């Protein structure tokens, strides 16, 4: 009933869409994604992203962070993350496996620019890695 190849292609197209949107955020493109910045250690930066449950909780944390950032673009980005997470949840149903489901506010008030730029460049790195490994048979 559900054609898995169309869904996989839609996942790649949606990934390319989120990546181009974040590439359009000019201030983030000139910021080193892999550079670690103190205070935002809760943000899931470059750290082998190798399993379905960690990806789900990663996109969940990134979503929770974006909900608090007051930009309309970030709101749209959060909606794209909702559709993408549900697509990975349906893919996990396709492969058969269960998936279960603090200081960020302080930095949002004290350093909104930093919180945004870092969250976005680390998000950009996470999506490039997930994309580069969504074809080498992802497993639960």
């Amino acid at each position: 009933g559900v054609p898995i190849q169309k869904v996989q292609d839609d996942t790649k197209t949606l990934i390319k869409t989120i990546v181009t949107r974040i590439n359009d955020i000019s201030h983030t493109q000139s910021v080193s994604a892999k550079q670690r910045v103190t205070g935002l250690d809760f943000i899931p930066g470059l750290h082998p992203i190798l399993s379905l449950s960690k990806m789900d909780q990663t996109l969940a944390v990134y979503q929770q962070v974006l909900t608090s950032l007051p930009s309309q673009n970030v709101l749209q980005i959060a909606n794209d993350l909702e559709n993408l997470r549900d697509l990975l949840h349906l893919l996990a149903f396709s492969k058969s496996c269960s998936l279960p489901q603090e200081s960020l506010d302080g930095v949002l008030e004290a350093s909104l620019y930093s919180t945004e730029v870092v969250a976005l460049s680390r998000l950009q790195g996470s999506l490039q890695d997930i994309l580069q490994q969504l074809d080498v048979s992802p497993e639960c």
């Binding site: 197209t13 869409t17 749209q76 909606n79």
Partner: protein, 399 residues
């Protein structure tokens, strides 16, 4: 505890023609109450009844025309040695000479609808074989549509209903049920509306909002009732056959001068199924248009091709047109180029490019020394979407 008597005793006629008696529950009682209703129907026969109910309402079967209902209610605590309240003040409810079942029907074009009626003629129920139906006191309804439910109840059945044509401020058909030649002044209101409204949606080029447009040209005539758009979003995709989901939410949309309503959903869920329909909340009920399910990804309007250039190749004289595909969509696109001689009136010729990897085309031109105007538009190769707008005009240099 001795509770107080129930208050707010009201009496209404149900759509079925039953007498609904209701009263206010004591919001201060920390325990369930049972009620005893005493009522006296003064018809041609006096009937006294006393019923015990746990609900705050009673249904009395079949309101009798030309009867008077006197009603009192008392309360008692349901659980325990409850003392009864005193009786409420008696309330009187006076029924009417004709009764319709139901009194009004709101339906859509092409449906089947049937009315039942009871005619009291000088305190006497006439035979059902005497009732004749008429439309707007203008024409007798063919007896073929009549049905004898019983010796005293008549029925009229309409099939494949056509939209009611409004006569002045009257947007309904007055259906009369008469005792042979003599009709009565009381009539039934029949409203048949063309609910087949089309809603068209379009997602902006940045895929950040979706604007849906709809015309209420059908309903810019019925006043008193309200009309609003309701929707329900499904996590992914559209069902094979859209349905009216029991759980939905309204979206506030604003009417434009063009006479269309425009409602924008922002932010959007690109891969979520948006089911929308128009709801007509009338005093007599609610009407829903046939639901439609739209996937915003499939109604995207891409931005036009950018960086459009046109150059005449030295010595060869070919029109080299070149462009840059729009940022969105990522799917393979097809392009259409229009080109013409630069003048007051541009004779556009078009060329279609069906290979996604083509960023340029070469055209034969008749005058190597004229300025050509060229524009380009794009569309999804699979046809699942709209055409983009034409690019900004590109001019050739005279060489």
């Amino acid at each position: 505890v001795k509770p107080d008597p129930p208050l707010g005793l009201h009496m209404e006629v149900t759509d079925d023609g039953n007498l609904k008696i209701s009263w206010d529950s004591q919001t201060m009682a920390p325990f369930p109450l049972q009620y005893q209703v005493k009522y006296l129907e003064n018809s041609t026969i006096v009937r006294e009844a006393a019923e015990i109910v746990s609900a705050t309402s009673l249904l009395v079967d079949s309101v009798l025309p030309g009867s008077s209902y006197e009603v009192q209610v008392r309360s008692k605590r349901l659980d325990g040695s409850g003392v009864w309240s005193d009786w409420s003040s008696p309330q009187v409810f006076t029924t009417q000479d004709v009764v319709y079942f139901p009194p009004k029907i709101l339906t859509s074009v092409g449906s089947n609808a049937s009315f039942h009626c009871i005619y009291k003629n000088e305190n006497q129920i006439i035979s059902s074989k005497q009732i004749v139906w008429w439309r707007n006191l203008a024409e007798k309804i063919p007896e073929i549509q009549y049905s004898i439910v019983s010796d005293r109840v008549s029925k009229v059945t309409f099939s494949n209903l056509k939209a009611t044509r409004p006569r002045g401020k009257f947007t309904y058909d007055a259906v009369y049920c008469c005792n042979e030649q003599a009709c009565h002044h009381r009539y039934a209101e029949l409203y048949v509306i063309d609910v087949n409204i089309n809603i068209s949606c379009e997602t902006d080029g940045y895929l950040t909002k979706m604007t849906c447009r709809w015309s209420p040209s059908t309903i810019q005539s019925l006043v008193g009732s309200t009309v609003q758009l309701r929707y329900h979003r499904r996590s992914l995709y559209c069902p094979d056959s859209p349905s009216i989901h029991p759980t939905s939410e309204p979206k506030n949309c604003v009417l434009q001068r063009d006479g269309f309503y425009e409602c924008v959903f922002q932010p959007i869920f690109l891969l979520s199924g948006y089911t929308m329909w128009i709801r007509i909340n009338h005093s007599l009920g609610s009407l829903d248009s046939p639901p439609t399910c739209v996937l915003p990804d499939s109604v995207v309007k891409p931005l036009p091709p950018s960086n459009v250039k046109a150059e005449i190749t030295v010595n060869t004289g070919l029109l080299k047109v070149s462009w840059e595909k729009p940022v969105f969509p990522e799917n393979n696109l097809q392009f259409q180029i229009r080109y013409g001689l630069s003048g007051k009136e541009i004779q556009w010729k078009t060329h279609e490019v069906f290979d996604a990897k083509s960023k340029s085309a070469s055209l034969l031109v008749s005058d190597l020394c004229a300025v050509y105007v060229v524009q380009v538009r794009c569309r999804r190769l699979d046809g699942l979407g709209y055409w983009s707008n034409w690019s900004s005009p590109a001019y050739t240099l005279v060489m």
